[PDB]
Amino acid sequence: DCTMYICGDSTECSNLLLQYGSFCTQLKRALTGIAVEQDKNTQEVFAQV
Amino acid sequence: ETKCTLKSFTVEKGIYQTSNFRVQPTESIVRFPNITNLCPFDEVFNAT
Ligand SMILES: *[C@@H]1O[C@H](CO)[C@@H](O[C@@H]2O[C@H](CO)[C@@H](O)[C@H](O)[C@H]2NC(C)=O)[C@H](O)[C@H]1NC(C)=O
């Protein structure tokens, strides 16, 4: 989670972080692709019958 | 919540994630309850 790691429990970074815009919402899409793809690898090794 | 997280009015079938869960604070607190060692000013200001 981008919010808690960088400026958790903070009401001053909350508005400030939006000044950078679309950084930490880009990172989630990168890692979510890896996690989803991980299950596919196991599918291609055992689900052949 | 997931509509505005994805910045769209439509969502497709699947599992998504949103703003993380957190319990907000309620009250405010302070410290240093015992204070001692007052400076001796009375004899300066009230000597006979
Ligand atoms: C001075 O500091 C001491 C250290 O804790 C205080 O001692 C206790 O304080 C609590 C909460 O204030 C009281 O419930 C206890 O009864 C205190 N102990 C004793 C033996 O009385 C003390 O209260 C402080 N002084 C003042 C004036 O608050």
CSV table of N, CA and C and ligand atoms in Angstrom, one decimal:
chain,number,residue,atom,x,y,z
A,1,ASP,N,0.9,-1.2,0.0
A,1,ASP,CA,0.0,0.0,0.0
A,1,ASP,C,0.9,1.2,0.0
A,2,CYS,N,0.7,2.1,-1.0
A,2,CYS,CA,1.5,3.3,-1.1
A,2,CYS,C,1.3,4.3,0.0
A,3,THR,N,0.0,4.5,0.4
A,3,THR,CA,-0.3,5.5,1.4
A,3,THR,C,0.4,5.3,2.7
A,4,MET,N,0.2,4.1,3.3
A,4,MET,CA,0.7,3.9,4.7
A,4,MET,C,2.2,3.8,4.7
A,5,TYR,N,2.8,3.2,3.7
A,5,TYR,CA,4.3,3.0,3.7
A,5,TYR,C,5.0,4.4,3.7
A,6,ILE,N,4.6,5.3,2.8
A,6,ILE,CA,5.3,6.5,2.7
A,6,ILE,C,4.9,7.5,3.8
A,7,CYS,N,3.7,7.8,4.0
A,7,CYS,CA,3.2,8.8,4.9
A,7,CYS,C,2.0,8.3,5.7
A,8,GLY,N,2.1,7.1,6.2
A,8,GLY,CA,1.0,6.5,7.1
A,8,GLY,C,0.7,7.5,8.2
A,9,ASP,N,-0.5,7.2,8.9
A,9,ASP,CA,-1.0,7.9,10.0
A,9,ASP,C,-0.7,9.4,10.0
A,10,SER,N,-0.9,10.0,8.8
A,10,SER,CA,-0.5,11.4,8.6
A,10,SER,C,-1.6,12.1,7.8
A,11,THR,N,-2.1,13.3,8.4
A,11,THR,CA,-3.1,14.1,7.7
A,11,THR,C,-2.4,15.2,6.9
A,12,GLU,N,-1.1,15.3,6.9
A,12,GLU,CA,-0.3,16.3,6.2
A,12,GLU,C,0.3,15.8,4.9
A,13,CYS,N,0.7,14.6,4.8
A,13,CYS,CA,1.1,14.0,3.5
A,13,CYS,C,-0.2,13.6,2.7
A,14,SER,N,-1.3,13.4,3.4
A,14,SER,CA,-2.5,12.9,2.7
A,14,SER,C,-2.8,13.8,1.5
A,15,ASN,N,-3.0,15.1,1.8
A,15,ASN,CA,-3.2,16.1,0.7
A,15,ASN,C,-1.9,16.3,-0.1
A,16,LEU,N,-0.8,16.3,0.5
A,16,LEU,CA,0.5,16.6,-0.1
A,16,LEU,C,0.9,15.5,-1.2
A,17,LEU,N,0.6,14.3,-0.9
A,17,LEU,CA,0.9,13.2,-1.8
A,17,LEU,C,0.2,13.3,-3.1
A,18,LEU,N,-1.0,13.9,-3.2
A,18,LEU,CA,-1.7,14.0,-4.4
A,18,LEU,C,-1.0,15.0,-5.4
A,19,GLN,N,-0.1,15.9,-4.8
A,19,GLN,CA,0.7,16.8,-5.7
A,19,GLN,C,1.6,16.0,-6.6
A,20,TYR,N,2.0,14.8,-6.3
A,20,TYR,CA,2.8,14.0,-7.2
A,20,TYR,C,1.9,13.2,-8.1
A,21,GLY,N,0.6,13.1,-7.9
A,21,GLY,CA,-0.4,12.6,-8.8
A,21,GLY,C,-0.4,11.1,-8.9
A,22,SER,N,0.1,10.5,-10.0
A,22,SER,CA,-0.1,9.2,-10.4
A,22,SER,C,1.1,8.3,-10.3
A,23,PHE,N,1.9,8.4,-9.2
A,23,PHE,CA,3.0,7.5,-8.9
A,23,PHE,C,2.6,6.2,-8.3
A,24,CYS,N,2.0,6.3,-7.1
A,24,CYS,CA,1.8,5.1,-6.3
A,24,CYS,C,0.6,4.2,-6.8
A,25,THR,N,-0.3,4.8,-7.6
A,25,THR,CA,-1.3,4.0,-8.3
A,25,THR,C,-0.7,3.3,-9.5
A,26,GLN,N,0.4,3.7,-10.0
A,26,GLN,CA,1.1,3.0,-11.1
A,26,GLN,C,1.8,1.8,-10.6
A,27,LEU,N,2.4,1.9,-9.4
A,27,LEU,CA,3.1,0.7,-8.8
A,27,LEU,C,2.2,-0.5,-8.5
A,28,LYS,N,1.0,-0.2,-8.0
A,28,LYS,CA,0.0,-1.3,-7.7
A,28,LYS,C,-0.3,-2.1,-9.0
A,29,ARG,N,-0.5,-1.4,-10.1
A,29,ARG,CA,-0.7,-2.2,-11.3
A,29,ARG,C,0.5,-3.0,-11.7
A,30,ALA,N,1.7,-2.6,-11.4
A,30,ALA,CA,2.9,-3.4,-11.7
A,30,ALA,C,3.0,-4.7,-10.9
A,31,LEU,N,2.8,-4.6,-9.6
A,31,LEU,CA,2.9,-5.7,-8.7
A,31,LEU,C,1.7,-6.6,-8.9
A,32,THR,N,0.5,-6.1,-9.1
A,32,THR,CA,-0.7,-6.9,-9.3
A,32,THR,C,-0.6,-7.8,-10.5
A,33,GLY,N,0.1,-7.3,-11.5
A,33,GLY,CA,0.3,-8.2,-12.7
A,33,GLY,C,1.2,-9.4,-12.3
A,34,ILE,N,2.2,-9.1,-11.5
A,34,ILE,CA,3.1,-10.2,-11.1
A,34,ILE,C,2.4,-11.3,-10.3
A,35,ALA,N,1.6,-10.8,-9.3
A,35,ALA,CA,0.9,-11.8,-8.4
A,35,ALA,C,-0.1,-12.6,-9.2
A,36,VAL,N,-0.9,-11.9,-10.1
A,36,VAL,CA,-1.8,-12.7,-10.9
A,36,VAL,C,-1.1,-13.7,-11.8
A,37,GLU,N,0.0,-13.3,-12.4
A,37,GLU,CA,0.7,-14.2,-13.3
A,37,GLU,C,1.4,-15.3,-12.6
A,38,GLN,N,1.6,-15.2,-11.3
A,38,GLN,CA,2.3,-16.2,-10.5
A,38,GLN,C,1.4,-17.5,-10.5
A,39,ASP,N,0.1,-17.4,-10.3
A,39,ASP,CA,-0.8,-18.5,-10.3
A,39,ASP,C,-0.8,-19.2,-11.7
A,40,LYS,N,-0.6,-18.5,-12.7
A,40,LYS,CA,-0.6,-19.1,-14.1
A,40,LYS,C,0.5,-20.1,-14.2
A,41,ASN,N,1.7,-19.8,-13.7
A,41,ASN,CA,2.8,-20.7,-13.8
A,41,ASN,C,2.5,-22.1,-13.2
A,42,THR,N,1.9,-22.1,-12.0
A,42,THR,CA,1.5,-23.4,-11.5
A,42,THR,C,0.5,-24.1,-12.3
A,43,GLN,N,-0.4,-23.3,-13.0
A,43,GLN,CA,-1.4,-23.9,-13.9
A,43,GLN,C,-0.8,-24.7,-15.0
A,44,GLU,N,0.3,-24.2,-15.6
A,44,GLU,CA,0.9,-24.7,-16.8
A,44,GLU,C,1.8,-25.9,-16.4
A,45,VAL,N,2.0,-26.2,-15.1
A,45,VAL,CA,2.9,-27.3,-14.7
A,45,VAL,C,2.1,-28.5,-14.2
A,46,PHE,N,0.9,-28.4,-13.7
A,46,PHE,CA,0.2,-29.5,-13.2
A,46,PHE,C,-1.1,-29.7,-13.9
A,47,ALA,N,-1.8,-28.7,-14.3
A,47,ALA,CA,-3.1,-28.8,-15.0
A,47,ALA,C,-3.0,-29.2,-16.5
A,48,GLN,N,-2.5,-30.4,-16.7
A,48,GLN,CA,-2.3,-31.0,-18.0
A,48,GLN,C,-3.2,-32.2,-18.2
A,49,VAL,N,-3.9,-32.7,-17.2
A,49,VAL,CA,-4.8,-33.8,-17.3
A,49,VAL,C,-6.1,-33.4,-16.5
B,1,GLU,N,-16.5,3.3,-4.1
B,1,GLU,CA,-15.1,3.3,-3.7
B,1,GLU,C,-14.2,2.8,-4.8
B,2,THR,N,-14.5,1.6,-5.3
B,2,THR,CA,-13.7,1.0,-6.4
B,2,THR,C,-14.0,1.7,-7.7
B,3,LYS,N,-15.2,2.3,-7.9
B,3,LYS,CA,-15.4,3.1,-9.1
B,3,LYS,C,-14.5,4.3,-9.2
B,4,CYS,N,-14.4,5.0,-8.1
B,4,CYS,CA,-13.5,6.2,-8.1
B,4,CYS,C,-12.0,5.9,-7.9
B,5,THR,N,-11.7,4.7,-7.4
B,5,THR,CA,-10.3,4.2,-7.3
B,5,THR,C,-9.8,4.0,-8.7
B,6,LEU,N,-10.6,3.4,-9.6
B,6,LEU,CA,-10.2,3.1,-11.0
B,6,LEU,C,-10.4,4.3,-11.9
B,7,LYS,N,-11.0,5.4,-11.4
B,7,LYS,CA,-11.3,6.6,-12.2
B,7,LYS,C,-12.2,6.2,-13.4
B,8,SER,N,-13.3,5.6,-13.1
B,8,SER,CA,-14.2,5.2,-14.2
B,8,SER,C,-15.6,5.0,-13.5
B,9,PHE,N,-16.6,5.1,-14.4
B,9,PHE,CA,-18.0,4.8,-14.0
B,9,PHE,C,-18.4,3.4,-14.2
B,10,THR,N,-17.6,2.5,-14.8
B,10,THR,CA,-17.9,1.1,-15.0
B,10,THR,C,-16.8,0.3,-14.5
B,11,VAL,N,-17.1,-0.9,-14.1
B,11,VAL,CA,-16.2,-1.9,-13.6
B,11,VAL,C,-16.5,-3.3,-14.2
B,12,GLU,N,-15.5,-4.0,-14.5
B,12,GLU,CA,-15.6,-5.4,-15.1
B,12,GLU,C,-15.5,-6.4,-14.0
B,13,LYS,N,-16.0,-7.6,-14.3
B,13,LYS,CA,-15.9,-8.7,-13.3
B,13,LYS,C,-14.5,-9.0,-12.9
B,14,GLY,N,-14.3,-9.3,-11.6
B,14,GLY,CA,-13.0,-9.6,-11.1
B,14,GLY,C,-12.9,-9.1,-9.6
B,15,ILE,N,-11.7,-9.2,-9.1
B,15,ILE,CA,-11.3,-8.7,-7.8
B,15,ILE,C,-10.4,-7.5,-7.9
B,16,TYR,N,-10.7,-6.5,-7.1
B,16,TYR,CA,-10.0,-5.2,-7.1
B,16,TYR,C,-9.6,-4.8,-5.7
B,17,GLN,N,-8.8,-3.8,-5.6
B,17,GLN,CA,-8.4,-3.3,-4.3
B,17,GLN,C,-8.6,-1.8,-4.3
B,18,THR,N,-8.8,-1.2,-3.1
B,18,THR,CA,-9.1,0.2,-2.9
B,18,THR,C,-8.3,0.8,-1.8
B,19,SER,N,-8.7,1.9,-1.3
B,19,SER,CA,-7.9,2.6,-0.2
B,19,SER,C,-7.8,1.7,1.0
B,20,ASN,N,-6.7,1.6,1.6
B,20,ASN,CA,-6.4,0.6,2.6
B,20,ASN,C,-7.2,1.0,3.9
B,21,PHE,N,-7.4,-0.1,4.7
B,21,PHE,CA,-8.2,0.0,5.9
B,21,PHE,C,-7.3,0.6,7.1
B,22,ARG,N,-8.0,1.4,7.9
B,22,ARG,CA,-7.2,2.0,9.0
B,22,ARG,C,-8.2,2.6,10.0
B,23,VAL,N,-7.9,2.4,11.3
B,23,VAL,CA,-8.7,2.9,12.4
B,23,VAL,C,-8.1,4.3,12.8
B,24,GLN,N,-9.0,5.3,12.7
B,24,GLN,CA,-8.6,6.7,13.0
B,24,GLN,C,-8.4,7.0,14.5
B,25,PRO,N,-7.5,7.9,14.9
B,25,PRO,CA,-7.5,8.3,16.3
B,25,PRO,C,-8.7,9.1,16.7
B,26,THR,N,-8.9,9.1,18.0
B,26,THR,CA,-10.1,9.8,18.5
B,26,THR,C,-9.8,11.0,19.3
B,27,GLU,N,-9.0,10.9,20.4
B,27,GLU,CA,-8.7,12.0,21.3
B,27,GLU,C,-7.3,12.5,21.1
B,28,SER,N,-6.9,13.5,22.0
B,28,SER,CA,-5.5,14.0,22.0
B,28,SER,C,-5.0,13.9,23.4
B,29,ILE,N,-3.7,13.7,23.6
B,29,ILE,CA,-3.2,13.5,25.0
B,29,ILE,C,-1.9,14.3,25.2
B,30,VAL,N,-1.5,14.6,26.5
B,30,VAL,CA,-0.2,15.4,26.8
B,30,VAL,C,0.6,14.7,27.8
B,31,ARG,N,1.6,15.3,28.4
B,31,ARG,CA,2.6,14.6,29.3
B,31,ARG,C,3.3,15.6,30.3
B,32,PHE,N,4.3,15.2,30.9
B,32,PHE,CA,5.0,16.0,32.0
B,32,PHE,C,4.0,16.5,33.0
B,33,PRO,N,3.5,15.5,33.8
B,33,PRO,CA,2.4,15.9,34.8
B,33,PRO,C,2.9,16.5,36.0
B,34,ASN,N,4.0,16.0,36.6
B,34,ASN,CA,4.6,16.5,37.8
B,34,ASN,C,5.7,17.6,37.4
B,35,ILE,N,5.5,18.8,37.9
B,35,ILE,CA,6.5,19.9,37.7
B,35,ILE,C,6.9,20.4,39.0
B,36,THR,N,8.2,20.5,39.3
B,36,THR,CA,8.7,20.9,40.6
B,36,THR,C,9.9,21.9,40.3
B,37,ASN,N,10.6,22.2,41.4
B,37,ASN,CA,11.8,23.0,41.4
B,37,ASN,C,11.5,24.4,40.9
B,38,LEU,N,10.6,25.1,41.6
B,38,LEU,CA,10.3,26.5,41.3
B,38,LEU,C,11.5,27.4,41.7
B,39,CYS,N,11.7,28.4,40.9
B,39,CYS,CA,12.8,29.3,41.1
B,39,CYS,C,12.5,30.2,42.3
B,40,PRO,N,13.6,30.5,43.1
B,40,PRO,CA,13.3,31.3,44.3
B,40,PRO,C,13.3,32.8,44.0
B,41,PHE,N,12.1,33.3,43.6
B,41,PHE,CA,11.9,34.7,43.3
B,41,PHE,C,11.3,35.5,44.4
B,42,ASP,N,10.7,34.8,45.4
B,42,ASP,CA,9.9,35.6,46.4
B,42,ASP,C,10.8,36.5,47.2
B,43,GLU,N,12.0,35.9,47.7
B,43,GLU,CA,12.9,36.7,48.5
B,43,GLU,C,13.5,37.9,47.6
B,44,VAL,N,13.6,37.7,46.3
B,44,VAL,CA,14.0,38.8,45.4
B,44,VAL,C,13.0,39.9,45.4
B,45,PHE,N,11.7,39.5,45.3
B,45,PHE,CA,10.6,40.5,45.1
B,45,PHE,C,9.9,40.9,46.4
B,46,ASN,N,10.2,40.2,47.6
B,46,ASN,CA,9.5,40.5,48.8
B,46,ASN,C,10.4,40.6,50.0
B,47,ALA,N,11.7,40.8,49.9
B,47,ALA,CA,12.6,41.0,51.0
B,47,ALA,C,12.2,42.2,51.8
B,48,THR,N,12.2,42.1,53.1
B,48,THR,CA,11.8,43.2,54.0
B,48,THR,C,12.8,44.4,53.8
C,1,LIG,C1,4.8,14.0,41.2
C,1,LIG,O1,5.2,12.9,40.4
C,1,LIG,C2,4.7,11.7,41.0
C,1,LIG,C3,5.3,10.6,40.2
C,1,LIG,O2,4.2,9.8,39.6
C,1,LIG,C4,3.2,11.6,41.2
C,1,LIG,O3,2.9,10.5,42.1
C,1,LIG,C5,1.7,9.8,41.8
C,1,LIG,O4,0.9,10.5,40.8
C,1,LIG,C6,-0.4,9.8,40.6
C,1,LIG,C7,-1.1,10.6,39.5
C,1,LIG,O5,-0.8,12.0,39.6
C,1,LIG,C8,-1.2,9.7,41.8
C,1,LIG,O6,-2.4,9.0,41.6
C,1,LIG,C9,-0.4,9.0,42.9
C,1,LIG,O7,-1.1,9.1,44.2
C,1,LIG,C10,0.9,9.7,43.1
C,1,LIG,N1,1.7,9.1,44.1
C,1,LIG,C11,1.7,9.3,45.4
C,1,LIG,C12,2.6,8.5,46.3
C,1,LIG,O8,0.9,10.2,45.9
C,1,LIG,C13,2.7,12.9,41.9
C,1,LIG,O9,1.2,12.9,41.7
C,1,LIG,C14,3.3,14.1,41.2
C,1,LIG,N2,2.8,15.3,41.9
C,1,LIG,C15,1.7,16.0,41.7
C,1,LIG,C16,1.4,17.2,42.5
C,1,LIG,O10,0.9,15.5,40.9
